[PDB]
């Protein structure tokens, strides 16, 4: 039961733009940087970073996906690789695409953008980037929506 | 060679006995929770933390030993916290093997990282969960802990090695 939207369309579009403007910040350009999306919409998002990247540097960012949901290619090896998820919790499946990653290759770093960050980590994991910190208690859960999968973009808190 | 002392002995005292005091506070006491070192000066680190977090709560807290090492101990992990010790995070590739080790053995509730100090220059997104000091650093520059257990002395110095 959707208990509340904390993000509707316009807030995700303002966010990912600004988490844009950062990687490419914290990086000095885009130059040798590759984002890969965990999951279904951790790979929406990645794409569209990658699209926003493109028009403010006027070079385009190579897009990974590399599945994970408890256990084609792209550069890795001195690339700057940035995982791309819709929701930190855990940390466990951002643990489990790092070793996927490791495996592939030996990145320069490591990086994370999230659009939202909910807390209760089990993990000495943090993101790089995050959209938005949305404080939640461990009965409650996060829903994402993106357009090109469900009809929308929006981000809720849904109750058990 | 040694460009300046960032922590001298009653630092790293005043660092360890407040990191004590933040571990029991936020797991709520240390039950189920686990202190597992890494590599000698982290083993180092965990003993003095367990010494300093029994005589505190009175709740003896078990200690792990853990060998990891990347090119250029026993008892319970599954559904226990296991607090990961080591004495300098820097691109934070050796606590990442480090998790690894620790999924060999069980799967823990939960995974924290006490850390001596922070030299920044993170190269995965692993932060610790308890810091003794944050210390800025170039990345030509190096730091050097010394503990008295191996070198006779507390210390913590960055050097332009
Ligand atoms: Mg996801
Ligand atoms: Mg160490």
């Known amino acids: ?10 807030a995700i579009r303002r966010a990912l733009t600004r988490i844009a403007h950062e990687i490419i ?20 998002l990645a794409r569209r970073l990658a699209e926003r990247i493109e028009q403010i540097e006027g070079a385009s960012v190579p897009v990974g996906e ?13 690339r700057n690789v940035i995982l791309v998820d819709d929701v930190l919790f855990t940390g466990r499946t951002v643990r489990a695409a790092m070793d996927a990653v490791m495996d592939l290759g030996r990145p320069a770093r490591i990086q994370l953008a999230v659009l939202v960050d909910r807390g209760h980590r089990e993990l000495p994991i943090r993101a790089d980037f995050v959209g938005k910190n949305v ?10 929506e993106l357009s090109e999968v469900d009809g929308i973009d929006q981000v809720s808190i849904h109750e058990k």
């Open 135 to 144: 404080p939640t208690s461990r009965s409650e859960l996060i829903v994402v």
């Open 25 to 44: 910040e914290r990086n000095k350009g885009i130059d040798g940087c590759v984002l890969v999306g965990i999951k279904t919409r951790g790979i929406y």
């Open 1 to 10: 039961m959707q208990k509340a939207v904390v993000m509707d369309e316009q």
């Open 66 to 78: 590399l599945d994970i949901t408890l256990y084609v290619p792209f550069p890795v090896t001195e």
